[PDB]
């Protein structure tokens, strides 16, 4: 896995960020949100 396009170091960290960090964080936020029992 490489890339000859400009700034080919961006998928290197963006693919883990989009596949691991983004889903983990958004699922965690939505999880704490749908389980929130604050009245209302």
């Amino acid at each position: 896995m490489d890339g000859s396009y400009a700034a080919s170091y961006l998928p290197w960290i963006l693919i883990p960020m989009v596949g691991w960090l983004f889903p983990a964080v958004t699922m965690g936020l939505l999880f704490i949100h749908i389980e929130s029992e604050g009245e209302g």
């Binding site: 983990a24 965690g28 999880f31 704490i32 389980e35 929130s36 029992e37 604050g38």
Partner: protein, 157 residues
């Protein structure tokens, strides 16, 4: 009435509770064994329980990737197993902490310290530290297997 040779009795003397007292579910050995696991051992604060559970789990979580992951056939077999185990323990810590965040919003009970917000956060902290340490120490053993063998065989005498 000279008939109680039966080993499977009602669970906790309540035959109408959805459970049965069996040699696996409620025998003296299983009771004294599970009850003295770090999760149930009395006289233990939540952080120590988490520490023990994490030590065990992180120690054994090295093996699967170490012997079967993609880095098994590289020169970084033990390092690859270690990295996989550390990521797994991090995700598991996030899961533990999220569970605690959601289950203990309301009124803090007074039964056991583990079943509170503070207690569960302490358990998660202990688990994180114990797991990272157990994974790193099993990695360190595997990487220095020669010195361990020489020690247990007296090779250095």
């Amino acid at each position: 009435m000279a008939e109680s040779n039966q080993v499977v009795q009602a669970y906790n003397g309540d035959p109408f509770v959805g459970h049965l007292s069996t040699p696996i579910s409620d025998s003296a050995f299983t009771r004294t064994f599970i009850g003295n696991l770090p999760a149930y051992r009395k006289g233990l604060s939540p952080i120590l329980r988490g520490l023990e559970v994490g030590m065990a789990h992180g120690y054994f979580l090295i093996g699967p990737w170490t012997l079967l992951g993609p880095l098994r056939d590289s020169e970084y077999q033990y390092i690859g197993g270690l990295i996989g185990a550390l990521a797994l323990i991090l995700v598991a810590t996030a899961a533990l902490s999220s569970y605690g965040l959601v289950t203990f919003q309301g009124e803090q009970g007074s039964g056991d310290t583990l079943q509170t917000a503070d207690g569960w956060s302490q358990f998660a902290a202990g688990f994180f530290v114990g797991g990272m340490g157990g994974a790193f120490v099993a990695y360190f053993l595997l990487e220095n297997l020669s010195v361990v063998d020489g020690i247990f065989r007296g090779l250095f005498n």
